[PDB]
A paper describes a structure:
In this study, we presented a ligand-observed MS approach for high-throughput screen of a 384-member fragment library as well as reliable estimation of binding affinity of each fragment hit. This approach was integrated into a FBLD program targeting the RNA polymerase of Hepatitis C virus (HCV), NS5B, which is a particularly attractive target for anti-HCV drug development. Similar to other nucleotide polymerases, the domain distribution of apo HCV NS5B polymerase bears an anatomical resemblance to a right hand with subdomains representing the fingers, thumb and palm. Structural and mechanistic studies of NS5B have indicated the existence of multiple allosteric binding domains including palm I, II and III pockets and thumb I and II sites targeted by reported inhibitors. The proposed discovery pipeline combining our MS-based approach and other biophysical techniques resulted in identification and validation of ten new fragments bound to two distinctive domains of NS5B, among which five were successfully translated to X-ray structures of fragment-bound complexes valuable for structure-based design of potent inhibitors.
To characterize the binding modes of the fragments studied, they were soaked in NS5B crystals to obtain the protein complex X-ray structures. Inspection of the crystal structures indicated that fragments 114, 204, 117, and 328 all bound at the palm I allosteric domain, while fragment 162 bound at the thumb region. Fragment 117 binds at the pocket mainly through van der Waals interactions with Met414, Cys366 and Ser368, whereas fragment 328 forms van der Waals interactions with Tyr415 and Cys366. We assume these weak interactions may result in the lower binding strengths observed for the two fragments. For fragment 328 showing SPR response below the typical threshold for positive binding, its affinity were estimated to be 20 mM by the MS-based analysis, suggesting the latter may be more sensitive in capturing very weak interactions. In this study, four fragment hits and the designed ligands all bound in the palm I pocket, where an overwhelming majority of NS5B inhibitors were also found to bind Specifically, Met414, Cys366 and Tyr448 in the palm domain of NS5B have been documented to be the “hot spots” for binding of high-potency inhibitors3854 and they were also found to be the dominant sites for fragment binding in our study.
Author numbering:
A (entry chain A), C (entry chain C): 1 to 22, 28 to 148, 154 to 540, 548 to 562
B (entry chain B): 1 to 22, 28 to 148, 154 to 539, 548 to 562
Write the structure that this text describes.
Amino acid sequence: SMSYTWTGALITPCAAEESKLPNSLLRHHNMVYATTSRSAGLRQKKVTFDRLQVLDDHYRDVLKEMKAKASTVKAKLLSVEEACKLTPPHSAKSKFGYGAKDVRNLSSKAVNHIHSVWKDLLEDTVTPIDTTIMAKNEVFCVQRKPARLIVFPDLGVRVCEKMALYDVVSTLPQVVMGSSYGFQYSPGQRVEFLVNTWKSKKNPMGFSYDTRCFDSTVTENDIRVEESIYQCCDLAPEARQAIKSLTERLYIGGPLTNSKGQNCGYRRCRASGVLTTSCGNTLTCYLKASAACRAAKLQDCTMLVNGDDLVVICESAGTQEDAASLRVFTEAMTRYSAPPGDPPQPEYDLELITSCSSNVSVAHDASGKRVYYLTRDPTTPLARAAWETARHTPVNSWLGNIIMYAPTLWARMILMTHFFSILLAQEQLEKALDCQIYGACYSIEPLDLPQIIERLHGLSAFSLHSYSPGEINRVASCLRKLGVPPLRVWRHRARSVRARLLSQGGRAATCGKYLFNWAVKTKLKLTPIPSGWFVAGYSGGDIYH
Amino acid sequence: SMSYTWTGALITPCAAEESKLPNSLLRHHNMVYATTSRSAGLRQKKVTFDRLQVLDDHYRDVLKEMKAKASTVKAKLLSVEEACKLTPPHSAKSKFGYGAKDVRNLSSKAVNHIHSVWKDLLEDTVTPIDTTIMAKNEVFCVQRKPARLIVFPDLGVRVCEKMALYDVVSTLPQVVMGSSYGFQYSPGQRVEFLVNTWKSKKNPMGFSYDTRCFDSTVTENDIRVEESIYQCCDLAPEARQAIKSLTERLYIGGPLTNSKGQNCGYRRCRASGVLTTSCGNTLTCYLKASAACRAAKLQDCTMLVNGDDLVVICESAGTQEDAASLRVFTEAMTRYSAPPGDPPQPEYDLELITSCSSNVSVAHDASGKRVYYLTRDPTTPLARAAWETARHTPVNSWLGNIIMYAPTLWARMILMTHFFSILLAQEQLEKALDCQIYGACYSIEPLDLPQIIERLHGLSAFSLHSYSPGEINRVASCLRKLGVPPLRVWRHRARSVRARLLSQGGRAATCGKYLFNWAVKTKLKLTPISGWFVAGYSGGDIYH
Amino acid sequence: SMSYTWTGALITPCAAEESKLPNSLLRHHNMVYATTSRSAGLRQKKVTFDRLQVLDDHYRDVLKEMKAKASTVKAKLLSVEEACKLTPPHSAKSKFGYGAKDVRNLSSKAVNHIHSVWKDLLEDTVTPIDTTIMAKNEVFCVQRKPARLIVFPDLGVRVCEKMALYDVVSTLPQVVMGSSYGFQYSPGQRVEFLVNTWKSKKNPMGFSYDTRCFDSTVTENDIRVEESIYQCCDLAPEARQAIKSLTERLYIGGPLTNSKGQNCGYRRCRASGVLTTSCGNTLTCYLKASAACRAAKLQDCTMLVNGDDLVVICESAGTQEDAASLRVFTEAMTRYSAPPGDPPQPEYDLELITSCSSNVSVAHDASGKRVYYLTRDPTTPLARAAWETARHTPVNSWLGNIIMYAPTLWARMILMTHFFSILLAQEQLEKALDCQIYGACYSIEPLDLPQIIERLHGLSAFSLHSYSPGEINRVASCLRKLGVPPLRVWRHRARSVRARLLSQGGRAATCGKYLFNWAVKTKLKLTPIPSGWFVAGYSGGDIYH
Ligand SMILES: N#C[C@@H](c1ccccc1)N1CCOCC1
Ligand SMILES: N#C[C@H](c1ccccc1)N1CCOCC1
Ligand SMILES: N#C[C@H](c1ccccc1)N1CCOCC1
């Protein structure tokens, strides 16, 4: 069918939308933009087309294999009270007279409506269910991207999605996909996995495969196959009936409605803003790709999947032959409706493989031993931190990034230094902040950062010191490019923060001592001190813990 | 959405379409025409429109109750062997190099292609499945109907439809609509049920509701709802998959390709020529009508549904209040996408209510006792009868009409006397013949008719004798209109046929003795001597 | 025993080998390639391996039956003069100071040497006879093939083989194998056999069986048994004594000597370039398959064998039951050391069965009567055709293909038109040409094709006109893939050649009249224009008539 059809009504904004940035961090303010509903039209062009999908014997085998694992999963029905407790406090309110705050409180009004929505789900497996369609606001750096289209149903239905399916998507993918299921690895765990599966090959080749607007390429067929996988589980028969109802009334497709209530058209592909999107996209991506591997006769593949993001490490057969089999892979995926964005290429050096906008690099600890850590190009993190420090938002990428990339040269020198300067100047070190980790919202005290980092990365995160050349150049140019002070300047700033932190004692002094030992010259001795976080992807799924 | 979209390509025939008749039976040959593909555009016009559909609590309540019943129903997957055996010997061949004969014979080629269609049905629940669109050649009398459009898929698909849904459509409607499922009634049992439910009311009113081109009014929503009722059954897991997939790729709509292989357009409404049409149409009618009854506050409603055909008998609230309530019933049925053709009218006389082109009337048996029988206007039967005698057709509507209308003045005196005459004059009494009964093709030996008619109608079918005045006139009027000899001539022809038959002894002598006892003058004292009326299968490509 | 063992010395070329085309016929010149010695190593990997062979009662029953049939056969020794006459004029020279030209001229130096090779064969039944190993230069279209490994003995030995065994391989296979011996059929007779035996089954099923590099799977045992089948015949005493010597000293194996005189290794399987290779392979293949049929319990098997190529046609026992008996069949062939390449599949459509790279299809003649004929995918003949026009070969596969496939849509419109146009351009219509029919080399005058075709295929061949949808589409997509112009262009090109041919009168007129009556619109009433070619197979046996 067609991924989308449009009525003509605009995708409309909920309020203002600031396209630009109103400085101690970065001087080239004109390189940072937010996407807006103004670029919506362009996105609608890039994301709408017909979908011709040709399956083959490889697709069916993998699927059979996947169904066999899915059949050993038992999963439970979440109560109204449990599914309420999972809704964020600022989730988008219902059009039926209650908000997320009512839900969280178990108000008998919300709860009665949730009951009613579930009962209709049980009673009617046909009528499409309404979604809202909005354009995302994300900050990026110049050299432009159109806004991405978020699509999601009413809060009533989302609490119902939780009840039917939260336990399935928290549990199944890991079993179905084993070590290929990305969202079970902390950053350190993901480096240990990739590094070890690299050295396990006689002669390793790796590639990341970029799919071209993946949610568009997900066919309604893909989504029923995904349902049959869910249905293999040992389910309660009432969950079984809402999982059917949901996939046919919501996941497969539906109408699109803008913020002003007008009808914008119709979707017959993946909505980003529903509970099954991460799990669904992950499964679908691993299915097609496993098959593409088999089609291209690739040797001893190990895969790692996170939603629409795929990496494959395998046994090379030579540069000529690798490059050719990679094009055979690409056809396989195309035939499966997962065509290429940037066409994929063989890498023979782990460091240069990018997956989940991240890559492996090495550095050394206090004792000199080489340590491998996860990193990324810091442009977007810096840009967003700049945006975050200028315009107050209730979402904190900087903090997520400090947690996720704590060992990195840039997170420690720039991000840690910068914001600990702000919190200290504003007397708000104590105050909890909300950050995203695998699409899930957690409330986090910035003063706990030392424990958190020790726990996810070991003490070495506090003492890494001979970063690789290619990493050091990456960061330096990013800094020159953005107009952020060179690294010598942040060392001097960090010493200032470290000292101010130490004078406050306790948790505050432990941040200074640990997060900033890299800046002192004479190091102190850093000793041990004294998480269902890295288990499953929930991005798009309206989750809070 | 639009029931049909047309590309502009014509609807094409396979062959020569006779339209006019090329005299024993009727003399006014120019009154009888046969529909052809020349009339198709006029039909295309009538059957293509937008459907605005809107449901309410009544609809929804009735659906809940319907599902509850379906849930009590086990149904099983037919094997390829069982499904092959159900295929008519003369069913349109597959475009994949085999025919019904190959199917019927378990040709491993036919069987292996069926296995391949089944497997694709399982992997793929979205790609529309190709149908072929044809204009129907039906025969009529004047005062002019344009051809109906038959729409159907390839034989491979059809066998898969049987594997998946033959047990459901043969079993689900009766459980779900109890006394309303019309196809559980032989013609004698249909009459009994109408008469008793009429007599059981304190003060009865009735109406039949003519839906304007029902097939086109069936929305893609209606067809999915039907699919969801089926799924309430306890079904094998491979059946469940083949049903959804069949409904999404076939039932719900898909491309229309003519006989020359060109795209005519796209369908988003009921297909006339699939296994589920009768069942679907019946359920979908029962659902809309049951709720419409509630919307109109109809007291003590009893209903009879045969696909798109509907009859309601209920308690009267007074003349005035009935008409008003009928108009409410119509309003509802319109919201639900079943606007009327001829708007419904209240009737206080059962013998004036028409349903499945038929009506109850009354006659008296040997003893004097009054018996109720089903009749109709004989115009179309006599038309097709004459057409069947001039041009050899593989279908025999005369036999079916003798079977379904054995007790009628017109079938007894004309159809029996005419064709038993012809059969005699060609030494073909032994030869089995193919006739349709609730859409299914059965082979029947005409010499068996006495045992069959007794079983289906009773001994009294061989001695009904004081037909109502209205009935006698309709028959006689129609005789004058069509130019077919009056009933006194047929009486004479019958004594002659009866004699010849009596002289052959055997089964032939029993036909003589029983089928034409009406004609003798001095009667003989007549003494005594299946699984046919259980479910509907028009469109379904079915044989036993 | 290892099919081959290798010293390490390479397989080397005689002249320098083209691998690429230097366009009237096809634009996509980079899709056409020739195999060269560059790929000898890739082949070497594929064809060298160990043979576990195990036999059973079914194998023995069938061998017994075979020897009984062969015991009814007489066969005579060929004179030297007879044997010399069968030697093609461009057959590789002897390394004992004479050539094929000398052989054909009955020179006393050649004849004296042939007597001495014979005298030594009679006396010595053990000393392995020298062979020469070479890489074959065959043309193909992409979608890569390593070259095949042609291996052959000295010309002296070859003339001796013809003396001993020519009469035997020309006559024995037929008697032994009966209706199964494939090389006894014209292409039209093969078509009639496949068709009639298909229609002779109540409920038919067929399969072809591809054997993983058959020459390599032939064990020394097989080649000895094969020998013992020959010894059943009534044979002159010296025929017997030479047949044993040849089978122990040359057929069983022996050393491999490259074109430079070095030792490449040693062979313990079938040699492609000896006289008994067609007859042996056909027997061995027939013997194993006949037994496997019985192992699998196939009902009413009708078998057709051409060397390593096998098709079986039998009564279907149902689909699951059919699928299973092939697996049983495959297991048996494997025990017997003839494992599969592509595993066999059941087929219920005669036109979808390929055998000898060919399938049956249907057209209609002058009268509209339906008529059966033999065809193939034209990709490979089109490719070899391109090549034979761009570069001068002494082997004209285009002429082979016109004779073999006169009735075909693609042969008539493209091969006929195209080559008759070139012969016309170059004033060479009168000039005899060498072509290979069943591996025997014939010199054929191209103006004789209208008689040759009438005899071999009937007048229907000159007027077939409603080729099946499947056959039309295969020919169409091949034109596109290969870049050859569409059939409308060949119609017009054919009318031109047809006119020019009619103007010359004589036999040139007759070709234009008949061969091209398809391009004319108003046709001529074609009427009758006023062989020992399809008896046995000699592919590999150095044979000329
Ligand atoms: N940073 C970050 C996370 C991530 C964040 C949000 C959604 C999905 C992933 N990222 C690193 C670990 O592997 C996955 C990619
Ligand atoms: N009542 C009833 C049946 C019937 C038969 C077939 C389809 C629907 C109804 N009856 C009317 C028309 O044909 C024969 C007599
Ligand atoms: N059947 C047959 C022959 C054949 C010829 C030569 C060797 C084996 C088989 N066929 C395919 C290849 O050449 C011409 C047509």
